């Protein structure tokens, strides 16, 4: 009847429990220790200025109403117990659209220690907004941020803290890289405060430093442009008594340059300035025209 | 709110010392406990760190092996076991508590350890 | 580790003047540097946590600033009880402390 | 204990609460104030004639039923209690598809005040329809808006207004659109008349000016250069037929 | 007035977790299909869309009443309170019911306990198109359905005499293909769960070579 | 304290009320007066032979079981009261994939008159099949239909009529 | 009547059942057996570096609480009772987007056996990430996979 | 453009050949593009007839 005693413990634990009130509502500030494990770093959409990321989001706090004594020191409970207790309402400030996976069941986790400490872990995918500056494209680097914090709880009520040393609190899996066009140089974390129109909120920030790989653009744009420039200049060595041949050379080289210039931009967002690739294509077009 | 350390003690070179740090007013399981070394007219030096709830420890690379840190959740105390003492181990050893963005808010009075 | 280069090594200033202590971080530490005041034969006392956050019971003249690698602690209108050592430490990684800064009159 | 006092007070407040009935059901209309903090305007689409904006949508009113005097501070309650309270039935007339962000929990805020004021907040993403006149494309200036109206409550049941009346909307100056630039925004209060009555309406408008540099790089310069190429034909001796015809045909096809 | 009494008496002491005749004999279900339209047939994904009204009828001796009322004509409100067969479509990439303005569902219970249950469905049905002889290719590919958890010993399906009825075929969305007929079939398939009665409807489609002529030839 | 009296009125209205039975089931045919206000006639998709339309769909029928006598002649009630009463199960015969908006709340409306007349409106986006005959393309004109009716209720049980003159009801 | 016997048996089995505790909550681990019948693999995309498969995902475990000895037959129940029983929290780590088919009802099965063996099946479509090495493309071989974990 | 070729002198053979070839290729591309925008109906539209007649003129 070990199940019976554990059921009795759980029933005594939720008796007279108001999940609408945070622990230490009027007499203490709730401190949520936070930890992120990145199981994969999804692709980066240059056109949409966003990036996908899969994580285990781990949150731990202390709830004094959930102290218990029994034959166990921890209670590994089914994830529907979390809906019966207070949990922090963390959200991602620069999140565009995220999903909390629930196949085949809600991908959630709740451990209660006998001293009242809780561990609450979720698996979720976040599409986050990463503003990009493409003046040095395709030789540019970016620091894509991930900002989260509490909705509706100001700094005076809920604060967030890294569970371990800040430099060790965001861990990226070894094989978890879905980056095709970029290279993940490392990650950085920080903590701060943002003043909103509803109060002062703690914000936890992570910065992922990404370096773009130039190879694709080399092969796809730079080599064709250099080749077209070489081909245009090859027309000089032809005899002057062959007007049709040199005319064909010039016109076809110009047409190829125009096609390449139209093609190159199609990969990038419609920014209002010229990138390094744009300058290279412009100079190649100038040489062909000359 | 209060961290009480053991009193000073004189030992001989090559001996072993086990310092004590008693926490009153809070549970050590709730935070990390730090041990810091201060030689005279010098800056502070982090010795190591322990997480009482898990028991795992981290040490400075220049103190690894020499020092051992342990706690006792029952008595709410932390220990620092120094081994193979040398003349340069004369200093004041502090016990500190992590809090509010890893700032080491509370410190012990310090123990003066000297080896003759 | 992360080396915290604290300057100047020492400094004297009369009572009523403004002083600025500076601390340099080797690598990036974000806003995870704290300032400690250690009076003679006493244990250190936390003054500033985060990077600009006065600990409870800290007078309003003390104030910190800085981010990334550069940090500073400006004591405006120092009094006679502000004579002590001032250590800067980073807690971004395993803690390291600056060599210290002695304040005389 | 203080927490037990708060729990008793909230259980008192929610006992006998009729969610079917608006505050002052048989009395003067309830006044509701609106605030918006615009987080981003993502993708202004000419093909779909619609833009996507993400915002923090705040609503404020007073409910005398939810008034308490034993606790001195403001009760921030778990968002799930909003399912047990009356909230205004606000909707966006021109939105096509929208959602409230639901990670880690539903991104909504409920905050009570001792006098009974309720602050209700939502993080919303709406894809509002944006009919654009492209007669001057890409030298065009577009004006599309977001219409906020109560679905079920006529103008004698509910009243909408902008809390602040000039600062009710924030964050507009920090919006960076790659292709546009927010030149101006305006707040309007109207009453609209349908066959079922007349309803309060609030309009938030944006004036977008399209940046032209991209189009200079993409379509204008190439055609100019192609025309210069065409003109090159006149410097070639008119005895050569293959060359000049090659120029002309290649230029046309390009 | 007294229809409320009948309904309350029917549902009192009723368990919808148990199929009728749980430990006696298999439940026999007669199925009818009305095909509103056969949607586009995209060979890229090797699938076709179909919109149908799916009717299912079975006997439940627990839903037996005595009154002057011969049939109880109900909406979807009471569908979730009685036992419903868990019929699913085996070769469907995806499918969905309709829910505007209310769930497009119908329930009728007769005096003797016969139940009729109809719902509207749109289905994207998978079928593998052997594209040899394309664009002179003809295909007849199926729509299969069965019970998910009830093996042959528990549920048996049965086509009625006039089970499958088509509409006009003039308003359908078949561009490359023309509907030329259909047929129904039954069989039993073996799976790790057990033996399941599988019902199949075959739609005969012949490609019409008018678009590809002017497009390629 | 009008709150308590109105709560009592609603509770008495919903006491012994069976929403599985249409009004006048025993001895009448339920007549539902319908009306459509098109807020936007969406884009037409040639490729899918369909169009999108956003409407206010208004329905109105008489329920004798919902008569009341109080200070108010009309009860402008919340959108969740509708779940507790019988409503017609109208559906679109040629609808493909329609959506009912619930931002920020269900875009529905229920108004009960003292005589038992109900008004029920909802905001929908309907996507409907429009079979086009492209023989004169691109010089072609089309008539895109929108057919709706009652699922589950035959003409002997539920009938539909336009609320105003047919020429003015859409 | 056998209907009454089955009804009372199921009512007894579901009475006092604590869904919050796994079988043998304090004792040894419960062993879950996995079966997969792959219906199809739908779209192997190099652009998205993923693929879609549809499978009949079945799990089997012993739950002594759900044991009965009064009737000799395996009780297949309406799949709504799955919300009242404990089931393992299996998830696929590398899946990007998944769903259980829901026409005409939620496509899941729950079958009890007299000795307590539960049989819990699901018809699932998962879009699973698969990073493809395209260096030898199109003369390449790809090794994808589905990761199943508690 | 195809009819412009009639005004070129009979000696400029490659010129007229290029005119004809490029005009036919253009007409084929236009036919494909104009058929792209439409549902793949199995019959011919008015646009199809106009394109076919223009294609016939270029070929002639
Ligand atoms: C992972 O997480 C996912 C997200 O959480 C999760 O998906 C969710 O799954 C749940 C469970 O299946 C879904 O909830 C069910 O939804 C069914 C309807 O499904 C269709 O409609 C919903 C939207 O539902 C609205 O509309 C219908 C009808 O229009 C209403 O009935 C709903 O209540 C709801 O209405 C509200 O919202 C409207 C706006 O939409 C408002 O206008 C309205 O006023 C209300 O405010 C769609 O989202 C669905 O699409 C999704 O699912 C399909 C599945 O094929 C996918 O294809 C698709 O892509 C989407 O993913 C779909 O179109 C409900 O019928 C169901 O509720 C009934 O069943 C439960 C359990 O039996 C009952 O408790 C409940 O009371 C309902 O039963 C009553 O009503 C039925 C009606 O037929 C009666 O037959 C029955 O007898 C019973 O009547 C009794 O109660 C009535 C009051 O309820 C009363 O009137 C009667 O008189 C009687 O007393 C259930 O809510 C949820 O929608 C999914 N969400 C999403 C986003 O998909 C996923 O499963 C998770 N995965 C895992 C592995 O866990
Ligand atoms: C983007 O697009 C939107 C949509 O068109 C524009 O919104 C319009 O904004 C203008 C002003 O910003 C609105 O015009 C205003 O109407 C108010 C109400 O009008 C009443 O009174 C007039 C007679 O004065 C009647 O004809 C009318 O029927 C109403 O009874 C006026 O009160 C406003 O001020 C006027 O009066 C004051 C009096 O002191 C004068 O000082 C003003 O100068 C002005 O004359 C004003 O006229 C208009 O209604 C809005 N459109 C709609 C559909 O409502 C945006 O302006 C546009 N630009 C941007 C940046 O968003
Ligand atoms: C469109 O927008 C509308 C507006 O919000 C949504 O309507 C809400 O839908 C949710 C989801 O069903 C409703 O929340 C539900 O509340 C029900 C009752 O809660 C009260 O009563 C119970 C007692 O029965 C108390 O325990 C509780 O404290 C409340 O006082 C519950 O039945 C539901 O619970 C379900 O899920 C939980 C999850 O943990 C399970 O525990 C349950 O077993 C059950 O499965 C749920 O909590 C909410 O009330 C609705 N709004 C209003 C105003 O009522 C539509 O859902 C939305 N539609 C779409 C498609 O987005
Ligand atoms: C056809 C002719 C022969 C072509 C053969 C292929 C050669 C290049 C294709 C692959 C090269 C490539 O991707 O290398 C990149 C090197 O980046 C670099 O550093 C490359 C930058 C150099 C660009 C090309 C310079 C040629 C200019 C010479 C023209 C002079 C005019 C002559 C008249 C990859 O880079 P990574 O970032 O992926 O990883 C490495 C860090 N770079
Ligand atoms: C509850 O919220 C109200 C509203 O913000 C607070 O009242 C504000 O108090 C600040 C500082 O005392 C003033 O500057 C504002 O002007 C007040 N706002 C209004 C609308 O009067 C109130 O202080 C909060 N409760 C507590 C206990 O602080
Ligand atoms: C649909 O299925 C029914 C039942 O299997 C078929 O009905 C039989 O039709 C044949 C003629 O082909 C008759 O000889 C049988 O007597 C019928 N049986 C019953 C029980 O009615 C029907 O043929 C099928 N439809 C087809 C094949 O188009
Ligand atoms: C109830 O189910 C069990 C299995 O789940 C059936 O017994 C098994 O049947 C299979 C198939 O014939 C055999 O391969 C196994 O050896 C049998 N035993 C076991 C332990 O799996 C049993 O027959 C079913 N009961 C009824 C009445 O059909
Ligand atoms: C032919 C080829 C294959 C792979 C990558 C690039 C190229 N490639 C080259 C090598 N040269 C060009 C010159 C002009 C226009 C296009 C190309 C081109 O596409
Ligand atoms: C849509 C349709 C086409 C052909 C034959 C019948 C029907 N049709 C109609 C017209 N109305 C219904 C009402 C309720 C349930 C089913 C149907 C139905 O199938």
Author numbering:
A (entry chain B): 10 to 299
B (entry chain J): 2 to 117
C (entry chain I): 1 to 105
D (entry chain C): 7 to 260
E (entry chain E): 25 to 241
F (entry chain D): 10 to 179
G (entry chain A): 7 to 156
H (entry chain D): 240 to 299
Could you give the paper's own sentences about this structure?
In vivo, numerous GABAA receptor isoforms emerge from the 19 identified subunits, with a chloride-permeable ion channel being formed by the assembly of five identical or homologous subunits. The GABAA receptor TMD comprises four helices per subunit (M1-M4) with the five M2 helices forming a central ion conducting pore and gating the channel.
We obtained high-resolution cryo-EM structures for α1β2γ2 GABAA receptor complexes with GABA and methaqualone (2.8 Å) and with GABA and PPTQ (2.6 Å). The carbonyl oxygen of both quinazolinones is positioned to form a hydrogen bond with the side chain amide of β2N265. β2M286 is positioned to form a π-sulfur interaction with the tolyl ring of methaqualone. While most of the modulators binding in the β/α interface pockets in the TMD occupy smaller, more superficial spaces, methaqualone and PPTQ insert deeply, making contact with the M2 helix of the complementary α1 subunit. The quinazolinones are thus positioned closer to the pore, enabling hydrophobic interactions with 10′ α1T265 (adjacent to the L9′ activation gate) and 14′ α1L269, both of which line the pore. Distances between the neighboring M2s (measured from Cα of α1S272 and β2T266) are 8.9 Å and 9 Å in methaqualone and PPTQ structures, respectively, versus 7 Å in the GABA-only structure. Surprisingly, the density fits methaqualone well, suggesting an additional, unpredicted binding site.
